[PDB]
Design a protein around this nucleic acid. Sequence first.
RNA 1: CUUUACUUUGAAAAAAUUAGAGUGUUCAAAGCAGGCGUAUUGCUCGAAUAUAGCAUGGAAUAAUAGAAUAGGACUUUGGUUCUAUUUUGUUGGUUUCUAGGACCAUCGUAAUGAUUAGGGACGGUCGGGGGCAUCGGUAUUCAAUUGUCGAGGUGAAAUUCUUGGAUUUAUUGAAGACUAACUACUGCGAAAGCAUUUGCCAAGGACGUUUUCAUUAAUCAAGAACGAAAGUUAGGGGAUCGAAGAUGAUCUGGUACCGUCGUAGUCUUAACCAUAAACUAUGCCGACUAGAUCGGGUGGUGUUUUUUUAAUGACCACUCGGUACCUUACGAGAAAUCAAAGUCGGUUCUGGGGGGAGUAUGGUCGCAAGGCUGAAACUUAAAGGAAUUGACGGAAG
Lengths: 125, 58, 84
Amino acid sequence: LLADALNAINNAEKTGKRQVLIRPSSKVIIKFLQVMQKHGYIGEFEYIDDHRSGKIVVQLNGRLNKCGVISPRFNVKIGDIEKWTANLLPARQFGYVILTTSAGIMDHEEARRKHVSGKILGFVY
Amino acid sequence: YHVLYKESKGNAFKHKRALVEHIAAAAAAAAAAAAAAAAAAAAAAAAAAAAAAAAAAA
Amino acid sequence: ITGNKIMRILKSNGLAPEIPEDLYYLIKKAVSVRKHLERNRKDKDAKFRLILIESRIHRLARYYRTVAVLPPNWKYESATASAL
RNA sequence: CUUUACUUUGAAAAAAUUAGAGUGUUCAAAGCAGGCGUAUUGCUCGAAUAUAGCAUGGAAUAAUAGAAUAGGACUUUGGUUCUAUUUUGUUGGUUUCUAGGACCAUCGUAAUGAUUAGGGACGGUCGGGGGCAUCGGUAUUCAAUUGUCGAGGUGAAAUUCUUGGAUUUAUUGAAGACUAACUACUGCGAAAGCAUUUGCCAAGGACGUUUUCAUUAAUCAAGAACGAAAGUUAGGGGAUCGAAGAUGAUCUGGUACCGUCGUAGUCUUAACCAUAAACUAUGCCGACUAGAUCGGGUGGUGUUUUUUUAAUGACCACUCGGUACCUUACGAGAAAUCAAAGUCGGUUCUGGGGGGAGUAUGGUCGCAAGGCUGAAACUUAAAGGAAUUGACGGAAG
């Protein structure tokens, strides 16, 4: 469920699918995709009815190089973010780490602004 | 009674003394059933509530 | 022949997804295929085949055990069928 | 800072609408905030504690018993008596509020994004999955009998078998093993493994509308059970071919290939040892990414089969599972190639130069051959994989 997730949307950008077709719904999916919207990595999104769970819709615009998960959800600190950001992102300046902070799920540099620690989900660059 | 036979096989005796001195422990188990039967008071209270509902809506 | 077994253990009828029915199935028929292992002992695949279905009784003993056993339903199953 | 808001109920013909009530409790201190000098109340800040009711428990209300606290009437001042309040135990009507037990439906939308994840019941269906008990056919061999006179082998040969009638041809009888064809680019079993036909006990997978319990799940050191062939133990059986063993031939030699015979084995029950270059040289389980064949279910208002018309079909559309497999783009890699052995997680196993070594020794198992676990001294400077060129062949064209 975590493994598959960011690989599907990444391979969609690799080939050049304009919208990507992804699905599930319960309550760890969509607001870091609003952090991706703020940063300009994806575009708009909406919800479509299903029989069970739900269907998402995501609009892409050819931005993602590689996104992927951090499969063990390690502890990040308000100092040691960038020990991970060194290996996670091969580029610095480009990309960001998404932390599951204590103040919800937000960006990593936004997490230093709040001064809040937590776990990690994935990288985007 | 046949708990004393299961106190011979799996011996907790030795001789003729300890044999008859058991009978007290097995008899005490029956007291637990009387405590469990007290839970029926909740069902009696529910029957009184049903009678009060029928007296209200008529 | 399955249908005569169904109307015994269950609350209602048709619910072998009410799981003490699989426990009673495998126990009762494992001793019946062992009549066919009291037949000869050469026997290749039916001894292999028996391991699968008789070990499934232990996964059925893992079953209701882990989730909820406030009054233990697991100990009703193993009493009625005669397991562990 | 900020409400429109949310909700249980009444009055309304319905209904707009309207009327009333609610949106935690307790304690100490400090700040700000109505009316007053204050007190005190409300809110905020900080803590502690708990997070659907009607069996049960608390409070309100009533009674009774004990204890504590406050006030009054009395007192031969110890105490008694009355009243109010709190706490604890017990009982009953009514009002209000809180724990706990059994069973079932749906999967809605906001925080990793095209998700039915585990067990089956019901009803159809396929297969060489298993064990046992029967039965049939061909070929071979042996025994008896008829018609008829030499054969068998090989590169040539001989051992060998025949006038005491062989090979053989037919008839009759017996004993064991195997099932040609069908037979496949086929199916089943988790792997080992599974081919005549029929019957009984008995297992698993896949499909279909659904019905249904509601994380029950995944993986798993140890541990437990199962085990092709070869070998061992005890009792049977030995047709068809034969390790060991005995002759003939071949050669420089021939303890072999070849030919004539033949022992243990090969078959069977029970028990044991448990290994294979045990194989896809690729662990299991779940999600993403273009293209065959076999089984199930549905459709083909059209055509054909055909006289219990069941054609199960023909031939075409799909939709699912297994997927001999073929072939291939993206992509990866040292490359051949793969089509995931690309690539991903959760979990388990395993590797750290060659020789010495799966050995030495101990432990453990075994009836025994032997299995399992498992090094070092020392030696050495490489062992090894993928891919090329050319010579050669008792290789082909």
